[PDB]
Amino acid sequence: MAEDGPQKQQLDMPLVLDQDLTKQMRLRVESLKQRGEKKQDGEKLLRPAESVYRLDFIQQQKLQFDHWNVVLDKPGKVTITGTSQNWTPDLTNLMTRQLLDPAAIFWRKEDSDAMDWNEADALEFGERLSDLAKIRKVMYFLITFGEGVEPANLKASVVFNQL
């Protein structure tokens, strides 16, 4: 019974990129080449356009996913690929066929202020995220920067309904 006015409160979680963390992985690969490792069983090569985003689930369940909204300073294209809470690139070698369901694609055109994305592929990953999220207070997402996006000009804000 809120007396202020707003009946249902709302809370948005700003996911933030981790470009510096991406550079740290590259340094480890450079050290490996000095002694070589013959990693031909499955070399893990990330693209300089891959940054790691981190999300902190502050509430155990009062939070609810309403509508993810990603904002870019300029139009363009970005690919978000999800990973099993177990297949981690640092603990496992990045494999293309061992990826779970395909990655969702979000893109904003110049005459469009709204981005069009695959709701069907994203919707399936929505409910799956609803569980693994209640058990893990933090989750990392991989994003790819296309052409026309400056390094840190990416901001990801998702609106959630707090009960």
Swiss-Prot record:
Compartments reported by the entry: Cytoplasm
Q: Which domain of life is it from?
A: Eukaryota
**Listed transmembrane segments:** none
What Pfam families does the record tag this protein with?
Olfactory_mark
Q: Which InterPro entries would you find in this protein's record? A: Olfactory_marker, Olfactory_marker_sf
Q: How does it assemble?
A: Interacts with BEX1 and BEX2.
Name of the featured protein:
Olfactory marker protein
